[PDB]
């Protein structure tokens, strides 16, 4: 009714090829996690947390360095007020253990590091992937999640199986907490990719990829959810699919949907919809690039960044505001 | 409750192939890099390098180059060190460790003496 | 490849006292340096890795800490197990390399 948008482009050079990013936002700060892993007969796996400054990512630290693990390790990272932690868990079972490593910081630069074991944890024969979360709001303490889902189900007895949280109440230390998730739209005989939670405003949801058997692609999902018990959720999907256009990232900014779509599977143009009203149009033309990988990066509740790569190295930031005037 | 228990004391001549074992329990064996650190009689420790047993790869101190060679069983979960052409100068206590988990075997005595 | 000379190279102290081992980098290490224990029984054990981190199940009479090159470890007040060989190591550039070792021993 009374809202307007404001949007400004920016770039960033990185000097390191990230396999994958993870950006967060600390002390109001731009930050990535870069997982650095080529696979030469000379080169290291490295695991960087770089910081914005003018227009070129500046590593801080590769927190690789501390530990023997081998592979691509799993990254949960969580930003408090004060405090980042962020956790590199071995890529897988038999098993009934995952060991993992916890990294502590009060600035963006320096870090306390120690191993920690999450022993006969609760997401066995769960996929995990790697996502930065906030701290979730239950009773009168904060939890910081780790949430897992089935790939794949025949058949499914208890939809309450399908995604699976485990929670910790001392800043990521011990994992004894487990949030129930009902799921009532999980399919069966589908695979699953990617899930991630995304928790705004003391509220949970689930953003997740699905496999299409008859066409070769994996479409965006997302599910909001519900508190009902202390330790247990309710998860419906949220529509949002759109003629012409491929669901990519969701967010909210004024207490309303912010959306963002591309024209096609390749992604040549980006849409960003605000309460499914207001558009505004991503053109990485000006060329040869495209918005593939586009995500939103929330600042506060009015000001968030919508990154996506352009060409190798090259970050394309656009930071938008949306409020209320009056 | 890691463990790594290393093989016993050995005594060879110079000149015939030695292989030190290092068997591991408690923990996913191609989840950690394994190193191997030498005990010099009479004096310090010496970083020999450290394998990968999930890539098979391996990193090497170049002072070791052509005198150890390490491979991993990853059905059995041990990891080897061997020195095909040993000399006296091989002469030492050889660990099996997890050198950043702070994980460390309680080491092998090697003598090379004719 | 980096060398770390470590001081004093042997030290003598009775229970109780406070002692400092100082290790040197002859580049820059960034922190990533650790002291074990080698105990007389060839046991090694792990005492501080980044610089100052305290390893779990070590106790709090052990520190480390940094002033530019220069790194130490300290025991505040020195118990009868204490008494060992104490080795820093460098683990930020390939190979790792190791001080020439400390050995402690009691002042009666």
């Known amino acids: 009714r009374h809202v307007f948008i404001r949007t400004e482009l920016s770039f960033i050079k990185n000097n390191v090829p990230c396999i994958r990013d993870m950006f967060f936002i600390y002390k109001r700060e731009l930050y990535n996690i870069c997982l650095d892993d080529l696979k030469g007969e000379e080169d290291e796996t490295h695991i960087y947390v770089q910081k914005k400054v003018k227009d070129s990512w500046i590593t801080l630290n590769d927190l690789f360095k501390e530990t023997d693990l081998t592979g691509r390790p799993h990254i949960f990272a969580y930003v408090d007020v004060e405090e980042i932690i962020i956790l590199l868990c071995e890529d897988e079972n038999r098993k009934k253990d995952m060991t993992c490593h916890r990294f502590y910081s009060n600035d963006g630069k320096e870090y306390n590091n120690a191993e920690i074991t999450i022993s006969d944890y609760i997401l066995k024969d769960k996929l995990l992937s790697s996502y930065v979360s906030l701290p979730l709001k239950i009773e009168n303490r904060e939890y910081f999640l780790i949430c897992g889902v089935s790939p794949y189900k025949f058949k499914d007895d208890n939809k309450k199986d399908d995604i699976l949280c485990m929670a910790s109440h001392d800043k990521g230390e011990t994992w004894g907490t487990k949030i129930v998730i009902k799921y009532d739209n999980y399919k069966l005989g589908v695979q699953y990719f990617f899930l991630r939670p995304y928790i705004s405003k003391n509220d949970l949801s689930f953003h997740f990829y699905v496999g299409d058997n008859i066409n070769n692609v994996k479409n965006v999902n997302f599910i909001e959810c519900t508190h009902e018990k202390d330790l247990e959720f309710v998860c419906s999907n949220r529509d949002f699919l759109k003629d012409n256009k491929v669901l990519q990232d969701v967010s909210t900014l004024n207490d309303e949907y912010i959306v963002s779509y591309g024209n096609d599977n390749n992604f040549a143009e980006c849409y960003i919809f605000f309460n499914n009203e207001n558009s505004i149009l991503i053109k990485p033309e000006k060329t040869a690039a495209g918005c593939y990988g586009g995500t939103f990066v929330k600042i506060d509740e009015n000001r968030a960044l919508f990154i996506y790569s352009s060409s190798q190295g090259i970050y394309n930031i656009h930071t938008i505001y949306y409020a209320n005037y009056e | 409750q890691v463990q790594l228990q290393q093989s016993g004391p050995q005594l060879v001549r110079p000149g015939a192939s030695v292989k030190i074992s290092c068997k591991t329990s408690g923990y996913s064996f191609t989840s950690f890099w394994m190193h191997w650190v030498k005990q010099w009689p009479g004096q310090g420790l010496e970083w020999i390098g450290m394998?990968?047993?999930?890539?098979?790869?391996?990193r090497l101190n170049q002072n070791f180059k052509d005198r150890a060679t390490l491979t991993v069983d990853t059905s059995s979960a041990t990891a080897y060190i061997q020195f095909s052409r040993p000399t006296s100068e091989d002469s030492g206590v050889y660990y099996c460790?997890?050198?950043?988990?702070?994980?460390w075997g309680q080491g092998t005595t090697l003598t090379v003496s004719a | 490849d980096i060398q770390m000379t470590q001081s004093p190279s042997s030290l003598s102290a009775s229970l109780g006292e406070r002692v400092s081992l100082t290790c040197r980098a002859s580049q820059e290490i960034s922190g990533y340096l650790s002291w074990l224990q080698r105990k007389p029984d060839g046991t090694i054990k792990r005492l501080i890795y980044?610089?100052?981190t305290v390893d779990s199940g070590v106790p709090n009479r052990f520190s480390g800490s940094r002033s530019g090159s220069d790194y130490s470890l300290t025991i505040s007040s020195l118990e009868s197990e204490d008494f060992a060989d104490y080795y820093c190591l460098q683990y930020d550039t390939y190979p790792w390399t190791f001080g020439g070792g400390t050995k402690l021993e009691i002042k009666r």
């Open positions: 460790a997890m050198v950043r988990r702070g994980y």
């Open positions: 980044t610089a100052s």
């Open positions: 394998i990968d047993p999930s890539e098979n790869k391996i």
